[PDB]
């Protein structure tokens, strides 16, 4: 594969991403349209790489809307089959994130927070719909380009409402995702996964772009439940008894009986209605959650909310696939079909 005179692109410069790492800012040379190209180097090697290539391909060419990070192009093998070791996905052209806005000298008005806020939950809104939960949302994941357009990558972490037994993840569910954006249900395997799980990690993002300042940002795994119960207070009884791991079900019954600690007090002179949807999002009870598509009503993002332009994705989005016990050049094949049928479709 090659940059050059007669080839499709021009690589501009090795920039970084949030998201996806290491990708090349490159131009499409017959339009001179700026696109960001990513190599997945070796990309058959390793079972778990591999599906991961697969999940996030299949994933961005189901979703086609303006807050969800989108597939420009994909490059086909140039070499013959065996030789085809390594995909180079061409993406939308994405300087910042989340994470470097809210961790500078930019500025970061409750206007800027209401916006970015009212991006993120009209992507969720539509991703959910499709029964998608992205699992490991984050300010880093969250691409922001110089037009403000905030669109949400980084799909390796997501599922579907049903799981295989055969992955690791579905027992050890603590370790799915980031620590410190990790729903209660996650934490503690409370056996309730559905896209209220995201709707936590919105929460922490929310309360992070208010105050430019982590909310939970726990050192270990105690220390983050210790961090979550000194504002939400102590978990009820019928969460504790949920929760199917003896040590931490003692530690937590060790400590003295909390009280919750009113929003206006973590966050002292902020806006009211951000207050108000923010209490809504960080709850123990993954079913206490308010959801996206309910957020997207709350008086807080009546600015820019209108339901016609807020879509659903139709149909959903299955994970069968993902489920299936695939050997590498298995999962290599049927990622070589998605650069076909993504060409395919394209004429
Ligand atoms: C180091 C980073 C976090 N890795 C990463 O971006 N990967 N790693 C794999 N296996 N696949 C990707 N990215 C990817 C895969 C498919 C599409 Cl359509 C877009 C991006």
Same mark, same amino acid.
């Given at each position: 594969?090659?940059?050059?005179?007669?080839?499709?692109?021009?690589?501009?410069?090795?920039?970084?991403?949030?998201?996806?790492?290491?990708?090349?800012?490159?131009?499409?040379?017959?339009?001179?349209?700026?696109?960001?190209?990513? %190599?997945?180097?070796?990309?058959?090697?390793?079972?778990?790489?591999?599906?991961?290539?697969?999940?996030?391909?299949?994933?961005?060419?189901?979703? %086609?809307?303006?807050?969800?990070?989108?597939?420009?192009?994909?490059?086909?093998?140039?070499?013959?089959?065996?030789?085809?070791?390594?995909?180079?996905?061409?993406?939308?052209?994405?300087?910042?994130?989340?994470?470097?806005?809210?961790?500078?000298?930019?500025?970061?008005?409750?206007?800027?927070?209401?916006?970015?806020?009212?991006?993120?939950?009209?992507?969720?809104?539509?991703?959910?719909?499709?029964?998608?939960?992205?699992?490991?949302?984050?300010?880093?994941?969250?691409?922001?380009?110089?037009?403000?357009?905030?669109?949400?990558?980084?799909?390796?972490?997501?599922?579907?409402?049903?799981?295989?037994?055969?992955?690791?993840?579905?027992?050890?569910?603590?370790?799915?995702?980031?620590?410190?954006?990790?729903?209660?249900?996650?934490?503690?395997?409370?056996?309730?996964?559905?896209?209220?799980?995201?709707?936590?990690?919105?929460?922490?993002?929310?309360?992070?772009?208010?105050?430019?300042?982590?909310?939970?940002?726990?050192?270990?795994?105690?220390?983050?439940?210790?961090?979550?119960?000194?504002?939400?207070?102590?978990?009820?009884?019928?969460?504790?008894?949920?929760?199917?791991?003896?040590?931490?079900?003692?530690?937590?019954?060790?400590?003295?009986?909390?009280?919750?600690?009113?929003?206006?007090?973590?966050?002292?002179?902020?806006?009211?209605?951000?207050?108000?949807?923010?209490?809504?999002?960080?709850?123990?009870?993954?079913?206490?959650?308010?959801?996206?598509?309910?957020?997207?009503?709350?008086?807080?993002?009546?600015?820019?909310?209108?339901?016609?332009?807020?879509?659903?994705?139709?149909?959903?989005?299955?994970?069968?696939?993902?489920?299936?016990?695939?050997?590498?050049?298995?999962?290599?094949?049927?990622?070589?079909?998605?650069?076909?049928?993504?060409?395919?479709?394209?004429?």
């Amino acid at each position: 594969v090659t940059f050059d005179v007669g080839d499709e692109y021009e690589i501009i410069e090795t920039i970084g991403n949030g998201a996806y790492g290491v990708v090349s800012s490159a131009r499409r040379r017959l339009t001179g349209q700026q696109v960001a190209i990513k %190599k997945i180097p070796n990309a058959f090697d390793v079972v778990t790489n591999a599906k991961r290539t697969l999940r996030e391909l299949k994933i961005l060419k189901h979703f %086609k809307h303006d807050n969800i990070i989108a597939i420009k192009d994909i490059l086909r093998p140039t070499v013959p089959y065996g030789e085809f070791k390594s995909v180079y996905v061409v993406l939308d052209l994405m300087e910042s994130d989340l994470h470097q806005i809210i961790h500078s000298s930019q500025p970061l008005t409750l206007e800027h927070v209401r916006y970015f806020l009212y991006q993120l939950l009209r992507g969720l809104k539509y991703m959910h719909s499709a029964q998608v939960i992205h699992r490991d949302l984050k300010p880093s994941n969250l691409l922001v380009n110089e037009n403000c357009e905030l669109k949400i990558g980084d799909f390796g972490m997501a599922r579907g409402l049903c799981t295989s037994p055969a992955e690791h993840q579905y027992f050890m569910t603590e370790y799915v995702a980031t620590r410190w954006y990790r729903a209660p249900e996650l934490m503690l395997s409370l056996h309730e996964y559905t896209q209220a799980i995201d709707l936590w990690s919105v929460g922490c993002i929310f309360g992070e772009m208010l105050a430019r300042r982590q909310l939970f940002p726990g050192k270990n795994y105690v220390h983050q439940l210790q961090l979550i119960m000194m504002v939400l207070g102590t978990p009820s009884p019928a969460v504790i008894q949920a929760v199917g791991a003896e040590r931490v079900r003692a530690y937590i019954q060790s400590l003295p009986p909390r009280q919750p600690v009113p929003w206006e007090t973590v966050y002292p002179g902020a806006d009211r209605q951000a207050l108000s949807l923010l209490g809504r999002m960080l709850r123990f009870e993954p079913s206490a959650r308010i959801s996206a598509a309910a957020a997207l009503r709350h008086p807080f993002l009546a600015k820019y909310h209108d339901p016609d332009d807020e879509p659903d994705c139709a149909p959903p989005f299955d994970f069968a696939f993902d489920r299936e016990a695939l050997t590498r050049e298995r999962i290599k094949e049927a990622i070589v079909a998605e650069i076909e049928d993504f060409h395919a479709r394209r004429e």
